[PDB]
Design a protein around this ligand. Structure first.
Ligand SMILES: Nc1ncnc2c1ncn2[C@@H]1O[C@H](COP(=O)(O)OP(=O)(O)O)[C@@H](O)[C@H]1O
Ligand code: BEF
Length: 104
């Protein structure tokens, strides 16, 4: 699976972990767009993890327990990408109606 997957990734470029995360990147600072507080270490790790997925053309799941700032992390993802990759738009977020204004 991994072999064919990594080859699928190579098509998308046109152990398991290091293979899946062949392209790496990390960042000590949060995206400068972000205001209203700072990110927690693990959130930063999560960001880096998501960034790695981006770099390796992989999709993934933020399965961190609950109430751990994923909303913020996804926002930081947006701003990260905009400050680093600079592909501003089009970016879609889909949420429950009961959570709309929490997100806004
Ligand atoms: N780095 C952070 N700085 C400040 N508050 C945070 C941070 N991470 C999480 N929070 C708290 O959690 C909320 C944001 O995420 P929340 O909705 O609580 O969890 P999730 O986004 O995982 O559902 C905010 O109310 C905030 O107070
Ligand atoms: F992941 Be949060 F608790 F919506």
């Amino acid at each position: 699976f991994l072999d064919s997957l990594s080859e699928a990734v190579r098509a998308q470029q046109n152990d398991y972990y290091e293979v899946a995360h062949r392209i790496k990147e990390k960042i000590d600072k949060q995206p400068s767009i972000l205001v209203g507080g700072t990110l927690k270490e693990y959130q930063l790790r999560g960001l880096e993890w998501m960034v790695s997925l981006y770099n390796n053309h992989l999709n993934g799941i933020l399965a961190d327990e609950m109430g751990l700032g994923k909303t913020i992390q996804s926002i930081s993802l947006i701003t990260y990408l905009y400050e680093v990759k600079k592909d501003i738009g089009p970016f879609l977020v889909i949420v429950p109606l009961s959570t709309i204004t929490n997100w806004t």
